Symmetry: D2
Amino acid sequence: RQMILAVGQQGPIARAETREQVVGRLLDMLTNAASRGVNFIVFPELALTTFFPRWHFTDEAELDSFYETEMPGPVVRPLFETAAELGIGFNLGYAELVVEGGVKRRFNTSILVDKSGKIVGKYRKIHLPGHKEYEAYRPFQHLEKRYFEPGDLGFPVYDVDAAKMGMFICNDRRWPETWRVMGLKGAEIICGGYNTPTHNPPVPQHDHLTSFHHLLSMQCGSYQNGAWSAAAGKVGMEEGCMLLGHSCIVAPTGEIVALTTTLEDEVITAALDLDRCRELREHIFNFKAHRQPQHYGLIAEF
Amino acid sequence: RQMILAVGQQGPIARAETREQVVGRLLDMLTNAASRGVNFIVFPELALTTFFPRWHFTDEAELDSFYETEMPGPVVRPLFETAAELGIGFNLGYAELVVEGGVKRRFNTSILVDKSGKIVGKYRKIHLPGHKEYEAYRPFQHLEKRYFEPGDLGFPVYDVDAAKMGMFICNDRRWPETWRVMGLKGAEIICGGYNTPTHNPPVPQHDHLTSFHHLLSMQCGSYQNGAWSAAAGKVGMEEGCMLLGHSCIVAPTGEIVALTTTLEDEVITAALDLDRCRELREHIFNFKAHRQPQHYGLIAEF
Amino acid sequence: RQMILAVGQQGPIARAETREQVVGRLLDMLTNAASRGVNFIVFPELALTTFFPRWHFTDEAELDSFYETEMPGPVVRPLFETAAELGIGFNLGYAELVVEGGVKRRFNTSILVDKSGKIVGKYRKIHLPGHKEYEAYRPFQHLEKRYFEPGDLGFPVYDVDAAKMGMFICNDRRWPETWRVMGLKGAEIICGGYNTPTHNPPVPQHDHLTSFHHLLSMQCGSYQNGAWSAAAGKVGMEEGCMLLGHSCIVAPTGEIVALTTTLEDEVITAALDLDRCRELREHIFNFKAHRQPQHYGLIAEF
Amino acid sequence: RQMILAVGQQGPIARAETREQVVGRLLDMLTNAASRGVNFIVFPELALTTFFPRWHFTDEAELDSFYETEMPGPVVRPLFETAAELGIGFNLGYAELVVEGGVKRRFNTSILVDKSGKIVGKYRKIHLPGHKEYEAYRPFQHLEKRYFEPGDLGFPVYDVDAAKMGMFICNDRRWPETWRVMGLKGAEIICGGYNTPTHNPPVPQHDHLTSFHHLLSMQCGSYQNGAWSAAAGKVGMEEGCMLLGHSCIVAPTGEIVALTTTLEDEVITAALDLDRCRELREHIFNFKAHRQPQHYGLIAEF
């Protein structure tokens, strides 16, 4: 029922920084995480590449190169081997390219891997931010809607060694529905990563609120679900675009219990008692006792 | 499209204080509010009496005394009459007693009254906190589940003058489903009152978070729905039990734009621009563009 | 003893926008303020001009253009006459140019003006931020140390109508000594203006903390000195440079009781009760009861 | 130049809980500290006894029994022997009773002990809070002014192994002077313990701000002096009186990087980069460049 959770935040990944060098950076953080007594570490969204959705692509071949066609391929294998051997679980984000009857599926993906290097769970980003086509005024694009399909896995919850775990990815954290669905499935930890620009071209008047909106979302989702939570950012000045810092671990009371202060590769850690969830989920948010889902119908309509 | 919104926070109402004295207080706060350009004022939950669910009542007639059999009755009409002349809408919370087909129904109720003094909409509290039967292990009782039944109106949104307004009452504010159902209905202002103790007998390790959990809920509900909101507290030491302060008005971005600092009758105000909702709702929280309700079904399951 | 205090936040002022146009804008915030029972409004730092210290000037007559040689000039007189007519006092900041004994003195200056329209006190910025000589690596300049010399009035406290008021300007808010000197002189309201960019060239890895540090400074300054405060920013996108919003009024307990949400000309208001300072000044922060200045010597050394 | 800094927070100590049992509790927090890779751990104010200043003492020998006459005595010595053997530094708070020609000195005291178990610095509480004589109306008393005299060591800074460290004790943290004196002497880490009741009888309309006021003080002190900080509380329900939790570690930017979530014994850690202080102290708070101490004299007057 007890454990140490870490977040391995990443500083920038340049456009042509290779996966071998990124896996190296990931591996260093996994060591820094045995040295602090970590049991499970959370890595960012799209952790193996620069954030390619910021560019408009004209070349299919060039776009596909940012996707994984297998998990792990030879290059990413040392991440898995080392984390098994070290007895550490992890959550990894990556672009998943799947071919089905010669049709191409693109997903923004994250997996849960347990202490033994088994992949025990997958989630595909359901809430895709940004816009569908090139906008010339923007210093950088946000073309997630073109480069990915909305996930088709739902918001599942998985048994990871001794913890029930739920994944969200980036923008997902800002939608109560993300949290609630996994909240109703008993998630004790809800975790994921993000790439969050500190500038928003169409709504620049909220830039100075970037950290606020991010932390607010994590804290409230945690609280209203009695769930531990972790957000692992990829951050700093990446290919000219400032990405938000402030990766966090948050308690089931919505109290942030660990926070990053650098814009670089950074490990943070926090102690989690899976039973703390009880302080909320057997009392003020005792769902079975207090919820009235018959009046919530409008949420599920489409 | 622009208005000044106000919260009329109340200090304690003692057992033996009369509805006429309370209405007196309510009238002054209204007076101060027209003072400061106010178009609409939010009053607390059960604004007409002490917080009676604190005690266990064996005498049915005396329990009945805390309820309204009509709205407004004789004592309350002057609060109405004034605001109709001062052209000032309000939200009033009160305990409601209604007999239908042989049943004596008890509701924790609030109503929206408009500029032209016309009651435009009612809401009856859906999420009742506390417990059903007397609990000796508690220093003071919380018998809302005993003295009220869950509201039968769902979560309506009403046109009040130029603004689409939704109501919550107290514990409702802590449930994302409250906010979401009304956000889906295009509420531009979500408002209500509360009686929130700063001691919670079952989970006293959360006592020092009372402000935090209250404000977190308001700020986040507002942001994730692009709604203005207002929370009107009844506060201070009432019959030996301390009630939480910090009534507030909040912007669609989740920023508190108005907060009270006294534990007494206190009016706070803020300018609202109904179009600011668009900064969230046409962009990051464009429900049509981004929501994926085929994955939310579990929230509506019962 | 009780008043309605206000902050009048400014949107951008263009290099090509005349002082007259700016005065007209200021005059609208005055009208808005009267509308809402305001007795005193705080306007931003260097309220009459674009924030010129961002450029390097070689021609002197043009640098001088941005300064006032008297207060009021014919152009500014209308603001004095209107406020006087409305019975509303104010804190106005401007660039002051005074020639004395063969020296052209340049100050960043603010004034307090009472209900009757009397200039009751002047302050000149003591903690100038930025740099003295042009710097290459800078996406914009911040040359306050070149265009202004550190103010020569100390940190005075003045009676304005019934209130003991002290001024700070911009960067002054971040030095506890600014607050503590005025705290020790019994200031009840500490108020002032600001131009705070959301990007800082030396340390850009704190840009996502811009609002945090602004808010932290105000709240804590108020809490620890038992002072009401208000900080009026000139905000938004001005000549390529993004300036921080979040103009605030703050209670002596450090609670933010009013906050702007736009990046444009905006008026916020709050009731102040000068006797609330007592809650801190007569108790936890009873200076005479608690301070031990024998140990504070290092703070005074130079 | 890098280290791990911990906070060993304490749950309640019973009036008749023996120092042998407290020392045991302390010893176990080292364990947790070594497992998370810790170099220095900070323990609470008066960490060896219950908080006796809440009772009105009339027998002097009973009072004396809460003070230490040596440091360490046999019973406390196991605390020193271990962290020396184990190589951790600690900050321990206690009641110091000293006899000077038959005159009794009474101090509220903390010591820094380095990696090798050597006492390398002392601080005595300078800002004694509370009241000096019995008050009948109070649930619990606060007679620090009677059981201690203000400290006679000022606010020193000490080299502890690789780090320059300053001490504060409890209420000290709410005074900017405390912070500024040690910041001017180049403190990299400013640390101490506290016992902070969530109820204050003379001003109970601030009880709900207890966490706010505490956290706010630590954040702003750290920010404005460019220092890492740590506040280790003794917390929870001690002899009928509820003490505030939220022990913390703060970065030189004011950001909280660790936070306790239980009201029981609890270790938190955070990675400390001693050169990060330069982010503030070589820039915005470049003292030697920006401060204007000839205008701060009033602060040091007495």
